[PDB]
Amino acid sequence: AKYTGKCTKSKNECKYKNDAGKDTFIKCPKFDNKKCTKDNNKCTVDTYNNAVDCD
């Protein structure tokens, strides 16, 4: 599935709510694009492939 969440810069992590309403965390990639560039930026998670892209 594809979820949209919000990321935090320092921890470089995406937080999204799954369909049960549970906050779930998945680290952004560390190097260049796909890393979180500002607190509360959008991030898109693909739970089929365990992949995230952070803004």
Numbering used by the authors: 1 to 55
Text taken from the publication that reported this structure:
PAF is a small (∼6.2 kDa, 55 residues) lysine-rich protein (13 × Lys, pI ≃ 9) and a potent agent against Aspergillus species and dermatophytes. The NMR structure is a twisted β-barrel composed of five antiparallel β-strands and stabilized by three disulfide bridges. Lys30, Phe31, Lys34, Lys35 and Lys38 (loop 3) belong to a conserved region of PAF that is important for antifungal activity. Despite the varying size and conformational flexibility, sclx4, sclx6 and sclx8 bound similarly the Pro29-Lys30-Phe31 motif in loop 3.
At twice the size of sclx4 it might be expected that sclx8 would mask a larger protein surface; however, sclx8 formed a PAF dimer [Figs. 2(c) and 4(c)] resulting in a total protein surface coverage of ∼950 Å2. Salt-bridge interactions involved up to three lysines from each monomer. Here, again a hydrogen bond was formed between the Lys30 Nα and a phenolic OH. In one of the protein chains Phe31 formed an edge-to-face interaction with an sclx8 phenolic ring. In protein chain B, Phe31 was disordered [Fig. 2(c)].
